[PDB]
Amino acid sequence: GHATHYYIPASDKTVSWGFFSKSLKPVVELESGDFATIETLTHHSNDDASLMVKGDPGAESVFYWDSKRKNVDRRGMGPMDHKLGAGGGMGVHILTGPVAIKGAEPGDVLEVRIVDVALRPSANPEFKGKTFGSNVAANWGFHYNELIEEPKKREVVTIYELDATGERNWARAFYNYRWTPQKDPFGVVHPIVDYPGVPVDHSTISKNYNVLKNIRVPVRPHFGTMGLAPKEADLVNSVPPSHFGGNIDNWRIGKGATMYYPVSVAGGLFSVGDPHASQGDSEMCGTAIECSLTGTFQFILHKKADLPGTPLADLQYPLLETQDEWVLHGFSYANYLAELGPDAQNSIFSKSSLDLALKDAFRKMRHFLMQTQNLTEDEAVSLMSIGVDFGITQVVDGNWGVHAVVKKGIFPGR
Amino acid sequence: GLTSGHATHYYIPASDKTVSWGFFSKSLKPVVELESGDFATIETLTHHSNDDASLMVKGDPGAESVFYWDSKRKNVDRRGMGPMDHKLGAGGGMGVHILTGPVAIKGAEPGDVLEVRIVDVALRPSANPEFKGKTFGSNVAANWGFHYNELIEEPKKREVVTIYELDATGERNWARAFYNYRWTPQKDPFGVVHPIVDYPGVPVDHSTISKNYNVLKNIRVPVRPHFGTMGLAPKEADLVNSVPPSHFGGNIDNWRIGKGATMYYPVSVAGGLFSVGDPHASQGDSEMCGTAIECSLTGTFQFILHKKADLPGTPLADLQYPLLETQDEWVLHGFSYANYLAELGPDAQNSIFSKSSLDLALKDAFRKMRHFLMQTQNLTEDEAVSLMSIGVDFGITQVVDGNWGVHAVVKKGIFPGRD
Ligand SMILES: [Cl-]
Ligand SMILES: [Mg+2]
Numbered sequence A: 001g002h003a004t005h006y007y008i009p010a011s012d013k014t015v016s017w018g019f020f021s022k023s024l025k026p027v028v029e030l031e032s033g034d035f036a037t038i039e040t041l042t043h044h045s046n047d048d049a050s051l052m053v054k055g056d057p058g059a060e061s062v063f064y065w066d067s068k069r070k071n072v073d074r075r076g077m078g079p080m081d082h083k084l085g086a087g088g089g090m091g092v093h094i095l096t097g098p099v100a101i102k103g104a105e106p107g108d109v110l111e112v113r114i115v116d117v118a119l120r121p122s123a124n125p126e127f128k129g130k131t132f133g134s135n136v137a138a139n140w141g142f143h144y145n146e147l148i149e150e151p152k153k154r155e156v157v158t159i160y161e162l163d164a165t166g167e168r169n170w171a172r173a174f175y176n177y178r179w180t181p182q183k184d185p186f187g188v189v190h191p192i193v194d195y196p197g198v199p200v201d202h203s204t205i206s207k208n209y210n211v212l213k214n215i216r217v218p219v220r221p222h223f224g225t226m227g228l229a230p231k232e233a234d235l236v237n238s239v240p241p242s243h244f245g246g247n248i249d250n251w252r253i254g255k256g257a258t259m260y261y262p263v264s265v266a267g268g269l270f271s272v273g274d275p276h277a278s279q280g281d282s283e284m285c286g287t288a289i290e291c292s293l294t295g296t297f298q299f300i301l302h303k304k305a306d307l308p309g310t311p312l313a314d315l316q317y318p319l320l321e322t323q324d325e326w327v328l329h330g331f332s333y334a335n336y337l338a339e340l341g342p343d344a345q346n347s348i349f350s351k352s353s354l355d356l357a358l359k360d361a362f363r364k365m366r367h368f369l370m371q372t373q374n375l376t377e378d379e380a381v382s383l384m385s386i387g388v389d390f391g392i393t394q395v396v397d398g399n400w401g402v403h404a405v406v407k408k409g410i411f412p413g414r
Numbered sequence B: 001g002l003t004s005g006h007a008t009h010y011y012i013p014a015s016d017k018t019v020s021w022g023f024f025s026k027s028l029k030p031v032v033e034l035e036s037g038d039f040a041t042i043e044t045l046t047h048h049s050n051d052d053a054s055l056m057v058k059g060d061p062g063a064e065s066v067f068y069w070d071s072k073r074k075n076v077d078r079r080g081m082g083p084m085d086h087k088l089g090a091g092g093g094m095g096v097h098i099l100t101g102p103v104a105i106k107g108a109e110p111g112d113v114l115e116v117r118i119v120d121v122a123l124r125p126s127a128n129p130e131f132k133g134k135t136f137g138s139n140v141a142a143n144w145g146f147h148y149n150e151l152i153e154e155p156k157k158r159e160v161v162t163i164y165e166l167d168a169t170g171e172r173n174w175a176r177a178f179y180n181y182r183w184t185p186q187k188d189p190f191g192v193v194h195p196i197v198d199y200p201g202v203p204v205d206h207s208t209i210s211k212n213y214n215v216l217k218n219i220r221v222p223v224r225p226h227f228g229t230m231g232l233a234p235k236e237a238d239l240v241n242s243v244p245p246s247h248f249g250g251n252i253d254n255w256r257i258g259k260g261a262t263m264y265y266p267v268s269v270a271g272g273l274f275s276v277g278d279p280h281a282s283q284g285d286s287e288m289c290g291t292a293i294e295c296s297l298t299g300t301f302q303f304i305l306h307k308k309a310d311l312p313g314t315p316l317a318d319l320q321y322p323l324l325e326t327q328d329e330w331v332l333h334g335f336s337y338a339n340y341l342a343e344l345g346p347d348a349q350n351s352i353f354s355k356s357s358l359d360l361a362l363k364d365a366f367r368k369m370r371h372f373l374m375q376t377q378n379l380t381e382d383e384a385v386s387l388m389s390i391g392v393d394f395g396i397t398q399v400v401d402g403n404w405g406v407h408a409v410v411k412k413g414i415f416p417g418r419d
């Protein structure tokens, strides 16, 4: 007959901007086995509204901001009266959701199969068949303290053109510009990119169109931010990833990937956003090609009682599976909210470390190998030195990330 | 000319006459001097061969020459850059790798770049007649490994030797664990007891250890043969510990530095003074436990000299670090300190082991990729910064050699190339 398949469009009614929250009312509640097509929006759409907002009803509904109203006021987990704007930009990602999963209990694991991904086409009739994205070299980027050309303190927006049909499998830089102070419709001036979704006045910037000429950047569409609401606080900054998932910024989290997240609160409360058209391992400059995407997902609940003796045994972190690999996500702190105590959401940005992240990845790969692949500690330690590759996920989200990749094909299986 | 004739191709066998153990040195006399365009086939030996002498030394004349140690003498006494009278043994184990060389390159001057084409690699076959067609390697989970302070099973402080079996013919393209054992204190022929693996090449007495066979059962580990340590003697000091990689190359431990790879190193001493060793059968990105599958290899190489004056407008422009080229990629090597000898001063060879940082290694990789993009691919700083965020992948090379390593990988095919 009929499988259950929800459609969640991106609008001011279906997203939260810059935070996860266990207390948010779900947009929908589905059952294990059900599907959802979920539209997501890049929070960088107002870097060029003509290309990424205007004419797009969903984007317009989220980004609307004039002197007389702002459709989505809170952006981040901070005070409503924050001087930069409600939420303080303490968290910047537009998160479609939450999605509740019937019967999901703390200690369960949720499987999310990413079965398809499509670029959100531009509504601009001049660019039919194209989608645009934005890469911002930002004040929170790992490069920022290292620039050598004057002015050494600068932020730079680079707009990329993508083929929304997927016929062309590479991105083309369209133009770049240095960020100049932008006064928002409520009168707050932003001399750096300190608050998300501010409409840029294109009469106040100077565009350079000849950029990255004839360089063909491979497309790797993925969702930067995807996960389940954590228990430790009612409002959680969307920027740092953790045990619950979130803003992992692993380019591999896209079509054909299956993610597994530990459930920390009843109903699970899944959200997805921060769509990217492509990204490198490190996300050096602070962002990817930030670009709107629609995904189709299947949700499968795994009960705690059924985890032992499977790859999900005692799973406490975000685990990625493809047809041929497992990819494990280490962070500077495995659960930064718990491990850094009450002040975690402030202190994490002062405590970032790749060395800690690799230690964490070591622990997780040891666990995976010991608890799911029948290896002793000594076996796991040897194998991971010779047959696991560890890479840098991102160094720009406060809780930094290292991933560990192992091929399925080497193992005899259970 | 158009007349046929012989090219110059040296053969350097591994022996006590052709290796130095645990150090680079600009003062070492070259074993061979060759010219740009010339070849050498160079045998290398793993410094872990005495983890099982029956498999990796006995009956192998070259290995026997290097590893010989009786109550009265060692054929290769210095192992490391340290004092000849160090308590552990000559050299102090301050550096552990058996390095075949040095090879001098005629006309190489400080400021030049040496290209080294790795054109072929062969496993060094075991001489053990019971294992014809096989080569053995050793992976040691060691005291200097990133895991060592993190172990959860008792005894929590332990080192573990895992011996692997390889097909020397290359027909089978994967490695099989043979056995493992915990390191127990080993008394060397001079009577010095080594409770941890603190000095290289100690003959393990197999009556003092307990072997576990059939470990990692039915796991097929891919083979990725490479040279862990390869590079040029640096100018900054006279004896230099082989463990930390740097500007001159050395102990990079990038699994990609094998057959079909071309390396480029900045020359800092006249003659270049190239050596190669620390052969590996396979390794993962991080070299987590302290070592790879440490396994003897023979390579064939071509040496091509690039004069300082000819570097501009090429990928080698102002090259100051080890650069790897394959058919489809460039791979740049960042380290906690780009030139740790120059940057850390007189105590460098000690302090590097306390100053290790992946954060710093990534900052260095950032600088190096910025330089490559700006100086070789005609990109502005803003263009480079954007591109490396979206189209360069940064990985962890190793975290066990003091000067820790991050590599940046970019695909050649994305670029329009120089017009
Ligand atoms: Cl002829
Ligand atoms: Mg992100």
Ligand SMILES: [Mg+2]
Pocket: A224, A274, A275, A276, A287, A288, A290
């Ligand atoms: Mg993003």
Ligand SMILES: [Mg+2]
Pocket: B228, B229, B251, B252, B253, B278
């Ligand atoms: Mg090495």
Ligand SMILES: [Mg+2]
Pocket: B228, B278, B279, B280, B291, B292, B294
């Ligand atoms: Mg080695």
